[PDB]
Amino acid sequence: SQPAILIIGGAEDKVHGREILQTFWSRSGGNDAIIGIIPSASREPLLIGERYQTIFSDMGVKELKVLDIRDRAQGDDSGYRLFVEQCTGIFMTGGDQLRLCGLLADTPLMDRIRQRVHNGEISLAGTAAGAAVMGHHMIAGGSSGEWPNRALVDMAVGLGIVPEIVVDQHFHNRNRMARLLSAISTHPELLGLGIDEDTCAMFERDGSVKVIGQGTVSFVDARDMSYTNAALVGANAPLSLHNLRLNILVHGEVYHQVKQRAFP
Amino acid sequence: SQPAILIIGGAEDKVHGREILQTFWSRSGGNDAIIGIIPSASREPLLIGERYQTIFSDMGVKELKVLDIRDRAQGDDSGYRLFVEQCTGIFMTGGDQLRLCGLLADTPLMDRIRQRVHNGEISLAGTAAGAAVMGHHMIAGGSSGEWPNRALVDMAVGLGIVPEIVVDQHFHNRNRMARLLSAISTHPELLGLGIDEDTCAMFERDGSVKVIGQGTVSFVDARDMSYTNAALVGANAPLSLHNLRLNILVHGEVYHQVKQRAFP
Amino acid sequence: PAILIIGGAEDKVHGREILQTFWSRSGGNDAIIGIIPSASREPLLIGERYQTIFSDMGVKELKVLDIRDRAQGDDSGYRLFVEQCTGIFMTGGDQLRLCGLLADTPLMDRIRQRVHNGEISLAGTAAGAAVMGHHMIAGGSSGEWPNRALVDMAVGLGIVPEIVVDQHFHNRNRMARLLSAISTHPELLGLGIDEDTCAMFERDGSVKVIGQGTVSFVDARDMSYTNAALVGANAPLSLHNLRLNILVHGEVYHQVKQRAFPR
Amino acid sequence: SSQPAILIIGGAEDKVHGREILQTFWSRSGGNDAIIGIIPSASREPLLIGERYQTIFSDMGVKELKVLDIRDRAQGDDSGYRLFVEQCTGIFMTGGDQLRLCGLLADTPLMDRIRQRVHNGEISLAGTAAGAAVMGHHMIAGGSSGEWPNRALVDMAVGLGIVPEIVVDQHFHNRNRMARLLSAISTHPELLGLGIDEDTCAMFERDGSVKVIGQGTVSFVDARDMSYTNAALVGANAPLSLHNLRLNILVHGEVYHQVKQRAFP
Amino acid sequence: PAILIIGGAEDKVHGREILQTFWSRSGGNDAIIGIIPSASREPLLIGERYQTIFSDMGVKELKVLDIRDRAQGDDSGYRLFVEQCTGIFMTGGDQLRLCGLLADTPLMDRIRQRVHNGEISLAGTAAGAAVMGHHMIAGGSSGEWPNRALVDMAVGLGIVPEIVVDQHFHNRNRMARLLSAISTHPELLGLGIDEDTCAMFERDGSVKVIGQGTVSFVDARDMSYTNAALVGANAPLSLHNLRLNILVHGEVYHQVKQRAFPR
Amino acid sequence: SSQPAILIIGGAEDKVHGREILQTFWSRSGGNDAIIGIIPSASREPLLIGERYQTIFSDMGVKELKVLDIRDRAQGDDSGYRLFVEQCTGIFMTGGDQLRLCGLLADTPLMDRIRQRVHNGEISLAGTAAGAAVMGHHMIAGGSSGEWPNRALVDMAVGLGIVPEIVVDQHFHNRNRMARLLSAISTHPELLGLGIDEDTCAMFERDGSVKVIGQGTVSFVDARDMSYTNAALVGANAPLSLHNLRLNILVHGEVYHQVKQRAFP
């Protein structure tokens, strides 16, 4: 029941065993959990907030609240501030990652959530857009069907929960490898995580990353790159990336951030 | 003008500078070239054979012949045998790689082409389906939009021109990374080459691979893999692949097969 | 930063003027406030009440320092919070309970030090006000002339050692027990603080009165005579040449000048 | 001593044991030679309360007693009662309700003559409880406890003006009456406040000294050097401020000197 | 494997019986055939002609060993091909040219050795037939009685040292020059091979005749008398007790038995 | 020697220098005593060719010459010519065309008597070129060179049967006639083939010996011990096989002995 950060690739199971959502429930304190749901990424926040309210209520918790922030000023809310002081876990729904950042970045309520996560007090999960915002550097958009090039990926600032990574989501399902490689070419100091649908990278306080769920997490590491043309070529030109390390993990496998290596 | 093997990712430039096709022309002896065109992969062999006949004729060569093999028995042709004894280069067009192998594998005419290539006497190029057949192990088909799994990729036997590799083609254009990773999981001894449209991996006799053209070649190396679940899981289950080496190269860059490393 | 000594039953519903002042002096939106509900036998309920009020005003961080045994006075987590905080709020309940739990603990030593050094604000209401002096009124009745047996004297937390505090003062007719306390310790300035009233001690030595009622400053430092040394504990006390200043909202008692000023 | 005095008694005085306060009034009225009038007008049971004090003073031994049972203001004209006042050596005003006592006695010929004979030093005067409350010109007629000082807390009225420079409160600490006395002083700061406990007495001597006798305390509340009050600025229900008050709490044997404005052990 | 000695102008258009026999004895579809056009002053054209014929029949590999200077007899690439081949075909042209280019070269030493060891087949037509003996007819006319001056004797490649070959034999009336040669070397069996005819030497010592015309076996090994030692080069030669066998397609001359057999 | 003989001359014999062959015929015909008949019937210029040999033999010195100019087969009945044949010591048959010579002379009384007188050893007989070709019973009348042996190569006909056991060819090596002689022998293997060069002679002596005289060679082609031929099996244009032939090529001074079937130096 140790607090953790769950980075979920979207379209997670809401109907069957709900393994990823049950893990967030357990790491939030299970029957003792006080869980806040942030549906700000969505233009249907009532429907999506109610969906997760029903799921976590059915699992059994102490308290639930939808933190239904629709305008930056709605973060300035007495009940939401109190709830964040009391909570054991926060869940960020899908939608649009630029909308979620637009509404929550550089707000006192999000600064307090981030502080409580960084201090090891509460769990945080984000799915789809809620996963995309985890890095300092965020993939806000970008196509498939192209070789890697700077113009392929739309880069933005995320919420900086895990500043050393760049997240992509619905990863193999939407063929997003080239846009993630294009992001890593821009920021080769960052470990890239490409997270499939109904798959999760769970960050633990000891530096380990545990993979949970149906698909894969791709760890794309350019920290030992021998050469790139990135400095030499135009925005639409193909990128070269030499000596990348790739680790494709499934459920139960671990990537250790200190060791910079994966384990079965 | 040293003979080489050109593995072309499909949809190569036939109209503008024709850089890849001009390289094959030059490595076949230029104005002295005697070039055979094999359009067997295609169900429109007359049209596709004539297209390349016109291109190489315009560049200026000594002789051209379309080796229009449409049934296995049509390989048993006096003129085609003579031409293969005389030729300096062979070009295999696109179409369907299973059709091309169906018609040419385990035939004396293809055995003689392969011998003359292996002995360093003639150049060989293949585009699209003509690239796919270069390995001993061939990707005959497979979808995108999935995490890597054995069932994603259709494996077959190719013509074994370069037995140590597995080729994929139209690679980033058709989002084929997952099917190539699935192929390499099946055969981790083989270096995977994912070749984009209008891009070429040119194999030289010294072991170097020179990249030419518009896009990228992805070298996917599982020879130092630390772990895979491949032995443990079902045909439709996601594959894990730990400690892969990835090199994404562009025009002018080299992968050295002996050194197992890329250079700018 | 300031020390707010609050007479109990402060407004938690309307303008909340006294609690808003503590909020402001603790850094307002940037405040990091610890709530000590140790005086109370319902610490969860009373800690949640002030968590709700300070969250409504808006602060950076809150912690309920729920000390229920003296061993929690050694607790590294609570002691770490005290190093990080900008304000500490001590709730009502029973002042002997609060002192029993917190006095002569590392946690309270550091609260007292950070208050004395002018690093953090401190507020206490009701029992939390009573503990501010070195000498504390722990109990006592009304309806009697001043006599030592009327007042239960104890040791407080020594935040403001030169005063003796009484609280719910006119509301519970506590003047005679405060006079009885001052007879025991005439070197100490007596402060009798009404319900929903506050004596706010500033770093310049001024004491500003805030709220609904009065603060009574009872000064025996120039007393000409008392019978206190001569008489038993149940005997009436005489106290000659006391100075009394009764102050309302906006008025100031200056500790250096030993005199009061209108707004 | 048998020198006439004014005894201002805080109520519930000892009627059973040593009766020290009542014996002092007896002594200052001439002891065995005393001619004492009892005014029970404050009481709605004047017969019972008048008889109670008649029995006490008779037991001590006096020359003559009379209950001056005034029940209508017009009876302050009565020749019989006015004759007795010319003959008496002491007057005792019992407890009850101070507004009733003032209603019946103030600005009557009978009370004008008592006041004159007291001011001329011819007779002693004692009042207990309501009988104490009427001693000033300004009188506390009522008021609660359990509040901060405010003008609405205290019911001010006109007393008999025996000692015009003071305002008396009675049962003082026993009924927690300090806030109502402070409320009275706020708008009469020229007057010395005397808060007199049960079974305690402030005995005004002819030289200006005030001797405290009895079980409890007398509180002298002096706002004559007050530096500030908000009294003129605020409404009747608002809290009062009073800056630079002098307080003297005295016990048996101690003296407040009215000329010196100071207390002595 | 066999040695095909072909009398020139062999059928290249119809049944190609002689060339198909060489193809078969070289391994047919598995044959690795070298073509030596060195006898010819048009080596490219004649090498291409046989490349076309053998490609039409279908073989594994062809190489034209285009030796135009004796230095190419040292060439490692041609010498490597000779180690790998299953058959060698020597075209027409001029037999002195062919010997000038190939005799006493490492390349021809290894061809001769691999033929002698029974590893490869060898065929020669016209000039390529003439070079098969150690003693070679390089030239000479017709229309004369036998005399030494009629025939130009030279050294051949010594593939079949016990014979002397003549070619286009009856077509160009070459009997008198062959008799003149045998007078010089009566230990040697003379073979006069007609156009589009072949003497095929088998490893068992049999010689099978294939094709359109005749092979004349002219045997002076039992000669009773000749004037050859006594007379000048322009004098008529006498040759007594010669044995002559004229063979056609399907017939056999057995070298061990020294006699001919019908089909 | 002056012993009668049969001289079979291969054509183009020396008419200018030593005339060795023609001098041998002169000597064997009786030299200065010779009575020589010349048959120019093979020639279409019989006068010119007859006169040429008349001049040569006259220059050597003889008793009598006559040109037997037969131009029609009926003139083989002529009394004058038949008388001369009874008187003569030698007959010389000139060149021309062997079919013409046989047409005119064969199975005539004149030639029957010449043949009889030759067989009885009374006269010498010489023939050159066409005159040589007619000596056998079987005659080569024509045929080309430049081909392998085949029956169509040679034109076979009937000769005068002077020496029935041989088949003669003439101008032999000079006109490359070996293949046509082999073609003739293939289907008459009982006959000894004699291929006689220009200015060479096979001189048949009465004892069976054949002496070679002159410039070139005589080829004796003997298929009497032939082990096989395909001649009976194949068409006229097909190549002939001939196994186990014996060949003897003789020069001036050498002898072929017909009884021994062997040559001598």
Swiss-Prot record, chains C, E:
> What keywords are annotated for this sequence in UniProt?
Hydrolase, Protease, Serine protease
Per the record, what are the reactions this protein catalyses? [L-4-(L-arginin-2-N-yl)aspartate](n) + H2O = [L-4-(L-arginin-2-N-yl)aspartate](n-1) + L-4-(L-arginin-2-N-yl)aspartate
Tell me the SUPFAM superfamilies matching this sequence.
Class I glutamine amidotransferase-like
- Which residue positions are annotated as catalytic? A126 (charge relay system), H168 (charge relay system), E195 (charge relay system)
Q: Indicate the temperature dependence noted in the record.
A: Optimum temperature is 35 degrees Celsius.
Tell me which EC number(s) this protein carries. Answer: 3.4.15.6
- Describe what happens upon changing D152A: 2.4-fold decrease in enzyme activity
Question: What is the top-level taxon of the source organism?
Answer: Bacteria
Q: What is the effect of changing D166A?
A: 5000-fold decrease in enzyme activity
What is the relationship between pH and activity here? Optimum pH is 7.5.
The molecular function terms of the Gene Ontology recorded here are:
peptidyl-dipeptidase activity; protein homodimerization activity; serine-type peptidase activity
The record's annotation in Pfam families points to: Peptidase_S51
Family to which this protein belongs? Belongs to the peptidase S51 family.
Identify the NCBIfam families for this entry: cyanophycinase
On subunit structure and binding partners, the annotation says: Homodimer.
Summary of the function given for this chain in its UniProt record: Exopeptidase that catalyzes the hydrolytic cleavage of multi-L-arginyl-poly-L-aspartic acid (cyanophycin; a water-insoluble reserve polymer) into aspartate-arginine dipeptides.
Q: What is this protein called?
A: Cyanophycinase
Q: List the source organism.
A: Synechocystis sp. (strain ATCC 27184 / PCC 6803 / Kazusa)
